[PDB]
Design a protein around this ligand. Structure first.
Ligand code: CLA
Ligand code: CLA
Ligand code: CLA
Ligand code: CLA
Ligand code: CLA
Ligand code: CLA
Ligand code: CLA
Ligand SMILES: CCCCCCCCCCCCCCCC(=O)OC[C@H](COP(=O)(O)OC[C@@H](O)CO)OC(=O)CCCCCCCCCCCCCCC
Ligand SMILES: CC1=C(/C=C/C(C)=C/C=C/C(C)=C\C=C\C=C(C)\C=C\C=C(C)\C=C\C2=C[C@H](C)[C@H](O)CC2(C)C)C(C)(C)C[C@@H](O)C1
Ligand SMILES: CC1=C(/C=C/C(C)=C\C=C\C(C)=C/C=C/C=C(C)/C=C/C=C(C)/C=C/C2=C(C)C(=O)CCC2(C)C)C(C)(C)CCC1
Ligand SMILES: CC1=C(/C=C/C(C)=C/C=C/C(C)=C/C=C/C=C(C)/C=C/C=C(C)/C=C/C2=C(C)CCCC2(C)C)C(C)(C)CCC1
Ligand code: SF4
Ligand SMILES: [Ca+2]
Ligand SMILES: [Cl-]
Lengths: 75, 75, 141, 729, 31, 75, 40, 80, 139
């Protein structure tokens, strides 16, 4: 289930979710990197885990810092 | 029957926290400027930083369970 | 003494931070009284207060006072528990009162722990504190 | 079957376990069939000959690959901007991108950059050409040949020696302290004054002109006639360039206590003065025990002569205890080697002695990490072999009432007090770290609890370093120890007060918190190892444990359950805590050195006091160049370190399989697989010779631990080398 | 300067001697 | 997983043309693509009374409520 | 792959020898040895 | 095969024999206990090493002890 | 020879492997008053015949688990089962109960083997028996 939800999170941020321009173009959250990075374990480590963990570790001093603390606490 | 009682206590607490300590009023008139927030945390030991600005002069944890969207879907 | 550090009211990082210390409670003066309290400490170059545990009497609030207060409270807790365990040993089921706790004798000992170090030295001098090595159960040596 | 030859109990075993146990018991020479003590010692002696030859062939290969495929003379010309080359890559799996990425350090072929310090060591000893390296490699080849023939010859009749010379402790220790320790130190001091200083002050001293060159103008005669201060006439000046005659002195034995300004290593002449003094003390200490004439001590007499009032028999019969137990000897030797390996690590980063090795940051990181890992292994092995001594070699009657049996007597006191102090350290270090993390996360990092390391700063002050204002001992100008002349003192004050060295680095409360974490790790690893060694013979749960041996799975689910009750299992548990402590210390050392080398010490000084700073500013931040060693856009030279990083993660997690899942599930699964093979047509023609079974319980623990350790080591080595070679190298 | 081909082959011919001696020592240690 | 390991090794060795990817040796999920196509031609041919498709993840156009995305064809 | 060093044909021959010939020969001899039902 | 030894603290409760799933142990007549019987292990070649007999033994520091030794097809419990 | 009707069974994958015809198998014989269903130790249910029943199994432990089921899970307790070991040469060796009496009950003529005249705590030290090839419990 960790792999299932990691697949879901990366594919939804890469090929679905994002911001739509008024002209009709969509800028995705992680800019479509799933097609080239999710084929390697290193891509999963760097572009999914390392890249998206920057929000949870740079949360201290803000309202998201509790999510930082549990990120330590589960560890 | 005891388990159903526990689940009903949980659901009653969810409706009470969505009515007294929430911003369902304010989110409903303006959906996409205000994020859902239904938990208000006391200012103590510096934990009032977690009461983040979610919109419309509210300070609370942004709830992600989707209670507001189901409540809007129920009328 | 402590040349690598500075008093907080001279360390300009401390003033630049204590101008904007966040209020923890609903009192608006909480950051201000935090600044007034922390200005008398010894701050580093980063501005946060640092504590000295060497045993300086002027730094008695850094180590000495909370340590002796913790020692007094921990002795109270330990002596209350030890006297409860000594008293309930002479009973029919001493395991029962260990798992369903007899309230009034525990309360009587709880409001009896305000003279604990005198009781500790009296029990040490009367032989009621330390048993012998032959008296206690031992593993095969 | 035949294999193993040494165990008929394992040879009769019809399962695959036989083969595994035939691998795992091959060097347990005592438990072999028909083993006497005499053949045990002779086989050990031949295996030592083989191991010495293996070490020499390893060195010869290092020399041959530096000479044949390295860039040693090109690095000789510029040993500050040219990367050393270990060996050339011949991998047919490489693509064009990896071939271009590993064609580095001026080579025309793919090469690896050496990080062992090898180029700096052969520069500091005066080697300058690949031909000398080739000649030395051929020399180590023929030396290994001589050692292999020596082992074979001393396994022959009329050359196999008796049991008496093996137990001859006095003569052997005199021989090792004098001929192997002191004479070798004297010979290396001779090499230093004959090559290393005259090659630092540029000259060619080869074997051709070896006979006719004086290292000093005034030769050996003022050494013989009187005062040797002539050899302290003029040291190398503070303008000296290494390998040239510019700024060169002529003196070969001086002292000024510090570093040569250019290379930032220890003074080579100071090294020679140290080495000659240490060789003289080793020569003196080597005339302490009896010989074939009768003037020295016998160790048994000194051991039997030391007693005390409240200690029982004192040191009675520890001579026969140590001399008849190879496991006691191994425990003492491994403990001493681990302590001095930790000393080697903690001294070489802070007082480097190899020319320009202090500017090679990745090399220094690799050396320190390697030696601390080796030290952790040796210390764990020392405690494990002490447990093996207690299981197999301990005589409670011959050791009655001495220090050994007294340690057995109060073993509960030792174990309980170690447990108390481990709980103390862990409780308060975790409480302070979590308090700091919580109040930093609440936007208010000024309510953190920060204790200055006042005692450690005072120890810094009482060595010369004046950056704290204590003004005591060597920091105090008017103290008695400061006014002694003693010309190491001003150079030592300059070396310890200039902040361009790792010598006595300035410390804040983050250093203090991680030092107490290191203390917790040391105390808990010692607690596990000491409880295992002192319960190896028995406990209240299992009092006949000495009848079951050092290593056994359990005593079953009876009596409450007894998993991991052997002393081998306590070794296995302490491996994890040793790796944890070593990871903590290496993390701290690397983060401090990344702060020092880059000049940004404030990141450590304001972020190491809480664990989110360790998580973010050390682990997350320094992996970015490592994990981009290969990416969808291409590769660089860190591609191998990214791959090894992932490989180590995989091996660590594979060890988690054997550590978490236990045997019987796998045995039932293998039973179903056995059924499948026995019922499949065209594969029923093929039968196994050994019956497939699951790995044993002890084998499961050992295999999971081996994978855990290999993954731990490879992951951290990849991270360390890639982060330091991307940021600096 | 770099080494020669004949130097490398002579080193391998030399290394044939500890190979044979290691074979002899391992054979003698086996029995 | 050995396909992932193969890809990690071939990318690390500088052989991206030997990987398993869309720009290399392709592993196209052709049955899932065919079922997505059949769901796209469902509303009007095999689902005549259905106006739109069951979900736009199968194929269609991107719903762009506010400036954000809600659903697009997940390729 | 190539080399500017002396006798660059030697990695060309010895990498398959140490990677394929030596381990296949060693495991074949060891597999024949550890299954030998000779005497014990 | 594994070794099963019976020591003189045996009080003849027969619980180790009842607990043994491979018929290793019997009870033979004895005189050292009030039950006048001691456990015996004539069939240790069938012992698998499960230590159920040790779990059943009520004497403190059990009078029956199983020592795992040489491993056979019978001792590893192999049906193949 | 071994006599008895085989219990009627549909067959299972849990039964005999090549060890049965290669090294050894085991047999259990028992007399049954009626036809009732028992549980196979190799998984599943079998029906035992009225009269003599002869079952072939892979291990001695499977036969003894079946015998425990026969003694404990049937209201008329089948207490007369015999367990044998069968070799591929054809020799049948009788195993259980060896003297005709279940081993939890004492019998005269049973010799004490594996019995130690010393206590558990008076085994000698391992250091006293080094390079002898024998354990503390074997001396
Ligand atoms: C089972 C679900 C659930 C959960 C998780 C919570 C959780 C919480 N409630 Mg809540 N509540 C619930 C059901 C629940 N409630 C129900 C069913 C009712 C109706 C009776 C309430 C009525 C209620 C009130 C009136 C208040 C809370 C408050 C709180 C918060 C602090 C709790 C406290 O004062 O500790 C007290 C601990 C003990 C008495 C012990 C906390 C977030 C407080 C809050 O949010 O402050 C603004 C508050 O004032 N709750
Ligand atoms: C498919 C994966 C793969 C494979 C198979 C290889 C294969 C190889 N690489 Mg390699 N490499 C890879 C991926 C791979 N690479 C990747 C992804 C990178 C990152 C870009 C690299 C980077 C790289 C570098 C930088 C180097 C190599 C080198 C080598 C060669 C080492 C051969 C050797 O010294 O003796 C064979 C191997 C060993 C002796 C290692 C021993 C380890 C085993 C476990 C010991 C077992 C002992 C045990 C007791 C077993 C019994 C003994 C047995 C004989 C019975 C070999 C051709 C090196 C080279 O060119 O060699 C000169 C080298 O310098 N590789
Ligand atoms: C003086 C003559 C002499 C000499 C030189 C030796 C030498 C040796 N004997 Mg020996 N022996 C002798 C007489 C001698 N023996 C006699 C007379 C007897 C009869 C009693 C024995 C009986 C004997 C036995 C029974 C055994 C040996 C063994 C050994 C070897 C020890 C292993 C080794 O190399 O450690 C070398 C260690 C050092 C050089 C230094 C130790 C560590 C230092 C202190 C710290 C490091 C120094 C420095 C800081 C690091 C520099 C870093 C470097 C990279 C530059 C060694 C070759 C053992 C062996 O291996 O068998 C073959 C063995 O089992 N000997
Ligand atoms: C000079 C050092 C030294 C010496 C002489 C010995 C000697 C001995 N030890 Mg000892 N030991 C040592 C250091 C030493 N040890 C250290 C440092 C530790 C701590 C780790 C131990 C821990 C230890 C334990 C816990 C035990 C011994 C045992 C033994 C005895 C039998 C060894 C045997 O057959 O193992 C067989 C050897 C092996 C199966 C080799 C496995 C190790 C491999 C090579 C490491 C893995 C490498 C890795 C997978 C490579 C792949 C990497 C690649 C993928 C990148 C023997 C007397 C055992 C004994 O008999 O005690 C009663 C025992 O139980 N020792
Ligand atoms: C992060 C992981 C972790 C942690 C915290 C511990 C913690 C501990 N181990 Mg340990 N251990 C671990 C991993 C860990 N281990 C692993 C992976 C292994 C390998 C199998 C071991 C092997 C091992 C051995 C072999 C031994 C220990 C020992 C100890 C204790 C040493 C005392 C100490 O450090 O301070 C005290 C404790 C702590 C700092 C941790 C607990 C503090 C908590 C967080 C306080 C809050 C508790 C909370 C209020 C509980 C309420 C729960 C509620 C929410 C439901 C301690 C309980 C030794 C021991 O028992 O010594 C006495 C010992 O012999 N461990
Ligand atoms: C033990 C030290 C050591 C090590 C780790 C290496 C490592 C390597 N050598 Mg090398 N070599 C060494 C000693 C060593 N060499 C010596 C002493 C010589 C003779 C002067 C050579 C001659 C040599 C040549 C000619 C070549 C290599 C090559 C290589 C690389 C691929 C492996 C190969 O084909 O080997 C082949 C090695 C030989 C044919 C010589 C045998 C090596 C020594 C004599 C045996 C040592 C055995 C060892 C100590 C026993 C213990 C091992 C342990 C597992 C128990 C690899 C980096 C190849 C290369 O450059 O690739 C880029 C290559 O073509 N080596
Ligand atoms: C460390 C040693 C080593 C070395 C040198 C190699 C080398 C190679 N691997 Mg490889 N590999 C290794 C270890 C190694 N591997 C390991 C440890 C693994 C994984 C566990 C892999 C997994 C791997 C995969 C999955 C594949 C390769 C492939 C290849 C080859 C790519 C080019 C090609 O098509 O070859 C073609 C050449 C050969 C396969 C061998 C040629 C040998 C001669 C010319 C033929 C026989 C000659 C004659 C009959 C015998 C001579 C007798 C006497 C003189 C000795 C290359 C030769 C690829 C491959 O095999 O392509 C076919 C491939 O698909 N490797
Ligand atoms: C800071 C370092 C880490 C601290 C951890 C250790 C805390 C100290 C432990 C002491 C409790 C045990 C005292 C022994 C109990 C005892 O009374 O032993 C008896 C002993 C007197 O006997 P003798 O020393 O005469 O006997 C030793 C030999 O002479 C016998 O031949 O007393 C001492 O030596 C006390 C000195 C402390 C012993 C050294 C302590 C470790 C220092 C290193
Ligand atoms: C008394 C008590 C118990 C009994 C307790 C025992 C058995 C204690 C056993 C003690 C022994 C045997 C030795 C004690 C060693 C104690 C020591 C050494 C000192 C700790 C250090 C103290 C003051 C000094 C600390 C420095 C000195 C100075 C104060 C500085 O500013 C700070 C600092 C830290 C440098 C319990 C636990 C049973 C129950 C309790 O309720 C009562
Ligand atoms: C006639 C005579 C004497 C004069 C002798 C003369 C004129 C010369 C004598 C020299 C002697 C006697 C010994 C020289 C020994 C040198 C040795 C043994 C070298 C050992 C090296 C080893 C083992 C390995 C070294 C390594 C190499 C190869 C490297 O490249 C890297 C480092 C390292 C790995 C360390 C004197 C007056 C004395 C006494 C009276 C009689
Ligand atoms: C189990 C066992 C064992 C083992 C053990 C061990 C392993 C231990 C370890 C131990 C250890 C590991 C220890 C250590 C310690 C150390 C020390 C104790 C040191 C000291 C030092 C000092 C005291 C010094 C001082 C000084 C300083 C600090 C500075 C200034 C100067 C001077 C020099 C003075 C044995 C085999 C025996 C036996 C059997 C069992
Ligand atoms: S270990 Fe198991 S099989 Fe062996 S005698 Fe004890 S109960 Fe019986
Ligand atoms: Ca020269
Ligand atoms: Cl990648």
């Amino acid at each position: 289930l960790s792999i299932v939800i990691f697949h879901f999170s990366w594919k939804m941020q890469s090929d679905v979710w994002g911001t739509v321009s008024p002209d009709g173009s969509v800028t995705h959250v992680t800019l479509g990197n799933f097609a080239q990075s999710a084929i390697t374990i290193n891509g999963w480590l760097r572009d999914f885990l390392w890249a998206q963990a920057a929000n949870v570790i740079n949360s201290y001093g803000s309202a998201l810092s509790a999510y930082g603390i549990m990120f330590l606490a589960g560890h | 029957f005891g388990h159903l009682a526990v689940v009903f206590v949980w659901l009653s607490g969810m409706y009470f926290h969505g009515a007294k300590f929430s911003n369902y009023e304010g989110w409903l008139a303006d959906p996409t400027h205000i994020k859902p927030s239904a938990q208000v945390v006391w200012p103590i030991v510096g934990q009032g930083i977690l009461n983040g600005d979610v919109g419309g002069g509210f300070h609370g944890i942004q709830i992600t369970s989707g209670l507001f969207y189901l409540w809007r879907a129920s009328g | 003494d402590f040349a690598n550090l500075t008093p907080c009211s001279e360390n300009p990082a401390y003033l630049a931070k204590s101008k904007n210390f966040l209020n923890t409670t609903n009192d608006p003066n909480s950051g201000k009284i935090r600044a007034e309290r922390y200005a008398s400490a010894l701050c580093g170059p980063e501005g946060y207060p640092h504590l000295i545990v060497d045993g300086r009497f002027t730094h008695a609030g850094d180590f000495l006072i909370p340590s002796i207060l913790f020692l007094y409270i921990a002795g109270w807790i330990g002596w209350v528990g030890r006297s409860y365990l000594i008293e309930i040993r002479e009973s029919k089921n001493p395991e029962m009162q260990e798992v369903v706790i007899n309230v009034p004798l525990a309360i009587k000992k709880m409001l009896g722990g305000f003279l604990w170090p005198l009781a500790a030295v009296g029990e040490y001098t009367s032989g009621k504190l330390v048993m012998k090595d032959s008296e206690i159960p031992t593993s095969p040596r | 079957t035949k294999f193993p030859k040494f165990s008929q109990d394992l040879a009769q075993d019809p399962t695959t376990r036989r083969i595994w146990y035939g691998i795992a018991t091959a060097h347990d020479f005592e438990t072999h069939d028909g083993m006497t003590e005499e053949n045990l010692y002779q086989k050990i002696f031949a295996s030592h000959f083989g191991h010495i030859a293996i070490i020499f062939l390893w060195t010869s290969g290092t020399l041959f690959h530096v000479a044949w495929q390295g860039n040693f003379e090109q690095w000789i010309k510029d040993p500050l901007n040219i990367r050393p080359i270990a060996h050339a890559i011949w991998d047919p799996h490489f693509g064009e991108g990896a071939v271009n990425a590993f064609t580095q350090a001026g080579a025309s072929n793919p090469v690896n950059i050496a990080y062992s310090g090898v180029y700096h060591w052969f520069y500091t000893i005066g080697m300058t050409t690949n031909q000398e390296l080739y000649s030395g490699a051929v020399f180590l080849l023929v030396l290994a040949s001589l050692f292999l023939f020596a082992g074979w010859l001393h396994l022959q009749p009329k050359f196999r020696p008796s049991l008496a010379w093996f137990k001859n402790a006095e003569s052997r220790l005199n021989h090792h302290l004098a001929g192997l320790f002191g004479v070798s130190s004297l010979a290396w001091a001779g090499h230093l004054v004959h090559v290393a200083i005259p090659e630092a002050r540029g000259q060619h001293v080869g074997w051709d002109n070896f006979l006719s060159t004086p290292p000093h103008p005034a030769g050996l005669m003022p050494f013989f006639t009187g005062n040797w201060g002539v050899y302290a006439a003029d040291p190398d000046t503070a303008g000296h360039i290494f390998g040239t005659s510019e700024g060169a002195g002529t003196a070969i034995l001086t002292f000024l206590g510090g570093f040569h300004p250019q290379t930032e290593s220890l003074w080579l002449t100071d090294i020679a003065h140290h080495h000659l003094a240490i060789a003289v003390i080793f020569i003196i200490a080597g005339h302490m025990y009896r010989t074939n004439w009768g003037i020295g001590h016998s160790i048994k007499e000194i051991l039997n002569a030391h007693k005390g009032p409240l200690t029982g028999a004192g040191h009675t019969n520890l001579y026969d205890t140590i001399n008849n137990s190879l496991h006691f000897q191994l425990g003492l030797a491994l403990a001493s080697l681990g302590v001095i390996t930790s000393l080697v690590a903690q001294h070489m980063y802070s007082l480097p002695s190899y020319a320009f090795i202090a500017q090679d940051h990745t090399t220094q990181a690799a050396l320190y990490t390697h030696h601390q890992y080796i030290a952790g292994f040796l210390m764990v092995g020392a405690f494990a072999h002490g447990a093996i001594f207690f299981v197999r070699d301990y005589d409670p009657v011959a050791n009655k009432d001495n220090v050994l049996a007294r340690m057995l007597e109060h073993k509960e006191a030792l174990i309980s007090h170690l447990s108390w102090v481990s709980l103390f350290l862990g409780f308060h270090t975790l409480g302070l770290y979590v308090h700091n993390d919580v109040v930093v996360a609440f936007g208010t990092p000024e309510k953190q609890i920060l204790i200055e390391p006042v005692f450690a700063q005072w120890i810094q002050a009482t060595s010369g370093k004046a950056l704290y204002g204590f003004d005591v001992l060597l920091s105090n100008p008017d103290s008695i120890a400061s006014t002694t002349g003693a010309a190491w003192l001003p150079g030592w004050l300059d070396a310890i007060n200039s902040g361009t060295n790792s010598l006595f680095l300035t410390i804040g409360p983050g250093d203090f918190l991680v030092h107490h974490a290191i203390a917790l790790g040391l105390h808990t690893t010692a607690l596990i190892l000491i409880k295992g060694a002192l319960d190896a013979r028995g406990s209240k749960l299992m009092p006949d444990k000495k009848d079951f041996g050092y290593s056994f799975p359990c005593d079953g689910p009876g009596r409450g359950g007894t998993c991991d009750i052997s002393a081998w299992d306590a070794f296995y548990l302490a491996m994890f805590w040793m790796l944890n402590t070593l990871g903590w210390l290496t993390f701290y050392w690397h983060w401090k050195h990344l702060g020092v080398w880059s000049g940004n010490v404030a990141q450590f000084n304001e972020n190491s006091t809480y664990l989110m700073g360790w998580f973010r500013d050390y682990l997350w931040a320094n992996s970015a160049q490592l994990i981009n060693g290969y990416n969808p856009y291409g590769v660089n030279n860190l591609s191998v370190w990214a791959w090894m990083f992932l490989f180590g993660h995989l091996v660590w997690a594979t060890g988690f399989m054997f550590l978490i899942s236990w045997r019987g599930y796998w045995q039932e699964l293998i039973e179903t697989i056995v059924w499948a093979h026995e019922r499949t047509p065209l594969a029923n023609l093929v039968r196994w010779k050994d019956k497939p079974v699951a790995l044993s319980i002890v084998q499961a623990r050992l295999v999971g631990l081996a994978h855990f350790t290999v993954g731990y080591v490879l992951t951290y080595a990849a991270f360390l080398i890639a982060s330091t070679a991307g940021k600096f190298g | 300067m770099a080494l020669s081909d004949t130097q490398i082959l002579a080193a391998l011919v030399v290394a044939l001697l500890p190979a044979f001696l290691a074979f002899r020592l391992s054979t003698e240690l086996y029995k | 997983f050995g396909l992932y390991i193969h890809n990690d090794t071939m990318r690390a060795l500088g052989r991206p043309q030997d990987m398993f990817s869309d720009t290399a040796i392709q592993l196209q999920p052709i049955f899932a693509q065919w079922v997505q196509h059949l769901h796209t031609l469902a509303p009007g041919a095999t689902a005549p009374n259905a106006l739109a498709t069951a979900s736009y993840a199968f194929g269609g156009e991107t719903i762009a409520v506010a400036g954000k995305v809600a659903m697009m064809p997940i390729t | 792959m190539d080399g500017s060093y002396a006798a660059s044909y030697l990695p060309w021959i010895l990498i398959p020898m140490v990677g394929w010939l030596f381990p296949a020969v060693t495991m074949g001899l060891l597999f024949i040895h550890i299954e030998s039902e000779g005497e014990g | 095969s594994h070794s099963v030894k019976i020591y003189d603290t045996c009080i003849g409760c027969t619980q180790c024999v009842r607990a043994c799933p491979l018929d290793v142990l019997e009870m033979v007549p004895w005189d050292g206990c009030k039950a006048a019987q001691i456990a015996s292990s004539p069939r240790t070649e069938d012992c698998v090493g499960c230590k159920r007999c040790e779990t059943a033994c009520p004497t403190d520091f059990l009078s029956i002890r199983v020592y795992l030794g040489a491993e056979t097809t019978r001792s590893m419990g192999l049906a193949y | 020879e071994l006599s008895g009707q085989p219990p009627k069974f549909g067959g299972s994958t849990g039964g005999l492997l090549s060890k049965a015809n290669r090294e050894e198998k085991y047999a259990i014989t028992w007399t049954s008053a009626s036809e009732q269903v028992f549980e196979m130790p190799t998984g599943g249910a079998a029906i035992m015949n009225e009269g003599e029943n002869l079952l072939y199994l892979a291990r001695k432990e499977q036969c003894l688990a079946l015998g425990t089921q026969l003694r404990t899970k049937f209201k008329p307790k089948i207490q007369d089962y015999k367990i044998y070991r069968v070799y591929p040469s054809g020799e049948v060796q009788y195993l259980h109960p060896a003297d005709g009496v279940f081993p939890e009950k004492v019998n005269e003529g049973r010799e004490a083997q594996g019995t130690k005249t010393r206590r558990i705590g008076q085994n000698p030290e391992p250091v006293t028996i080094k390079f002898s090839g024998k354990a503390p419990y074997e001396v």
